[PDB]
Design an enzyme around this catalytic site. Structure first.
Site, PDB file in Angstrom:
ATOM      1  N   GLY A   8       0.815  -1.224   0.000  1.00 14.87           N
ATOM      2  CA  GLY A   8       0.000   0.000   0.000  1.00 14.87           C
ATOM      3  C   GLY A   8       0.842   1.264   0.000  1.00 14.87           C
ATOM      4  N   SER A   9       0.377   2.276   0.721  1.00 17.12           N
ATOM      5  CA  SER A   9       0.956   3.630   0.665  1.00 17.12           C
ATOM      6  C   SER A   9       2.454   3.724   0.914  1.00 17.12           C
ATOM      7  CB  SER A   9       0.264   4.537   1.674  1.00 17.12           C
ATOM      8  OG  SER A   9      -1.039   4.879   1.209  1.00 17.12           O
ATOM      9  N   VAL A  10       3.000   2.800   1.704  1.00 16.35           N
ATOM     10  CA  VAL A  10       4.422   2.859   2.045  1.00 16.35           C
ATOM     11  C   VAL A  10       5.320   2.631   0.826  1.00 16.35           C
ATOM     12  CG1 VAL A  10       4.174   2.360   4.531  1.00 16.35           C
ATOM     13  CG2 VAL A  10       4.583   0.463   2.935  1.00 16.35           C
TER      14      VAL A  10
END
Ligand SMILES: *C(=O)[C@@H](NC(=O)/C(=N\OC)c1csc(N)n1)[C@@H]1N=C(C(=O)O)C(=C)CS1
Length: 324
Positions: free
Chosen positions: A60-62
Site C-alpha cells: 500500500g501507501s508505504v
C-alpha cells in the site's frame, strides 16, 4: 556477533505488544535497521514464525516514495511540478484518492498520499522501466539474509502488466514484499541512493550497495517525506519529538499467511530519522486491528514514534530541535 541491540529489541517488543493488545490485533512485527549499514538493530514479532521475513504483503501507501523517487531521478519531473489529481479511469477501473484534491505538486502527492498523483508519475515510464526499478529495489528478489523461510515476494513479469496494474503497483497493490524487504528498500532513501544488504550479523567491512538513484534524488525525497509527519500530513501520529522524521503510513493487504492463503488488512508505518542525516529505519506492521481505530496511522504511528524516539536516544543521537 549479532547486530541486534538488546536495548532496542526490548523497547520494540514492549511497544509492539502494547499496540497489539490495545487494538486487539492478530499479530505484529517491528524491524529496526541501521540506515547506513543494513544491520538489523531489532526484529520482533508476536509469538509464532518470523513474520518479518516469511510473510509478504501488498504494501500500500508505504510504496509511494519509490515511483516518486524514480520520477525525480529521471529528470522528467521537478518537485514543484503540479499534476491534475482528480479521479480518472483506466478502462472501467477508477483510480481515486481518499481525500480529493484538484491539483497537487510532488510534495503534496507525498504529503497527502495521493494514489492519482503517484500513478501519473509511474505512467511516465514503460512497464519495463518500472519493473526494472522495482527489481533494483529488491522487489521479487531474495535478500539472502540467512534467515530461513525468507520470502522473495512477488513482482509480476512486466510483459503481463495491464495499465491498471502498473498504476496500482505505484501505490502498493499488485506486488508483494515482506516487512524486512520493505525496510531494506528504504535504505535507497537513507543511504544516498544505494540499496544495502540486510544482515543480523555485525559487519566487519563497509557494506557496498547497489546504486539505484542519485544521492541528490535520495536527499530530495527525504525532504519531501518530512511533510508526511508534519501538520497536514498523513503520518502525523508518527512524529517524533525533537526530530524531523521522513515516513509513510497506510493500509497494506496480507494475501499469504505462512504457507496459506489469507485476506487481512495490515496497518503499516515506516520511516527514518533524523531525516536530513538518518541513523535509523523503523518499520511497523500490525495485522487486523479491530479496536480503538482501524486507520493505519493511529494504530502504528504511536509504535513508530516510541521505537524511533527511543532508538535515537539509545544510540546517543542529539535532538535537532527543542522538545515540545
Ligand atoms: C495508502 O495506504 C493509502 N490508502 C489508500 O489509498 C486506500 N485506502 O485508504 C483508506 C486504498 C487504495 S486502493 C485500496 N485497496 N485501499 C493511504 N492510507 C490510508 C490508510 O490508513 O489506509 C489513509 C487514510 C490515507 S490514504
Amino acid at each position: 556477533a549479532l547486530s541486534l541491540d538488546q536495548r532496542i529489541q526490548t523497547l520494540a517488543y514492549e511497544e509492539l505488544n502494547k499496540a497489539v493488545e490495545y487494538h486487539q490485533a492478530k499479530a505484529g512485527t517491528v524491524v529496526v535497521l541501521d540506515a547506513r549499514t543494513g544491520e538489523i538493530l531489532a526484529l520482533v514479532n508476536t509469538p509464532g514464525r518470523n513474520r518479518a521475513v516469511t510473510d509478504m504483503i501488498e504494501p500500500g501507501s508505504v510504496m509511494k516514495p519509490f515511483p516518486i523517487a524514480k520520477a525525480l531521478d529521471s529528470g522528467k519531473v521537478d518537485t514543484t511540478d503540479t499534476f491534475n489529481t482528480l479521479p480518472y479511469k483506466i478502462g472501467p477501473a477508477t483510480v481515486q484518492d481518499t481525500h480529493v484534491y484538484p491539483t497537487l505538486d510532488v510534495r503534496g502527492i507525498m504529503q497527502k498520499s495521493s494514489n492519482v498523483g503517484t500513478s501519473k508519475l509511474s505512467a511516465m515510464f514503460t512497464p519495463k522501466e518500472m519493473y526494472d526499478f522495482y527489481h533494483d529495489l529488491g522487489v521479487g528478489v531474495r535478500m539472502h539474509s540467512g534467515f530461513p523461510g525468507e520470502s522473495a515476494g512477488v513482482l509480476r513479469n512486466w510483459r503481463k502488466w495491464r495499465p491498471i496494474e502498473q498504476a496500482t503497483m505505484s501505490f502498493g497493490y499488485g506486488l508483494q514484499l515482506s516487512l524486512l524487504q520493505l525496510a531494506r528498500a528504504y535504505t535507497v532513501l537513507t543511504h544516498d541512493g544505494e540499496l544495502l544488504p540486510v544482515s543480523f550479523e555485525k559487519q566487519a567491512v563497509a557494506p557496498k550497495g547497489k546504486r539505484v538513484i542519485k544521492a541528490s534524488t535520495a536527499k530530495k525525497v527525504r525532504e519531501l517525506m518530512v511533510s508526511v509527519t508534519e501538520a497536514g500530513g498523513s503520518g502525523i501520529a508518527g512524529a517524533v519529538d525533537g526530530f524531523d522524521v521522513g515516513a509513510k503510513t497506510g493500509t497494506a493487504r496480507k494475501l499469504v499467511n505462512g504457507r496459506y492463503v489469507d485476506y487481512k488488512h495490515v496497518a503499516t508505518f515506516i520511516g527514518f530519522a533524523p531525516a536530513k542525516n538518518p541513523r535509523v529505519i523503523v518499520a511497523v506492521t500490525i495485522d487486523e486491528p479491530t479496536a480503538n481505530g482501524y486507520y493505519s496511522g493511529v494504530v502504528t504511528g504511536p509504535v513508530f514514534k516510541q521505537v524511533m524516539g527511543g532508538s535515537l536516544n539509545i544510540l546517543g543521537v542529539s535532538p535537532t530541535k527543542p522538545l515540545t
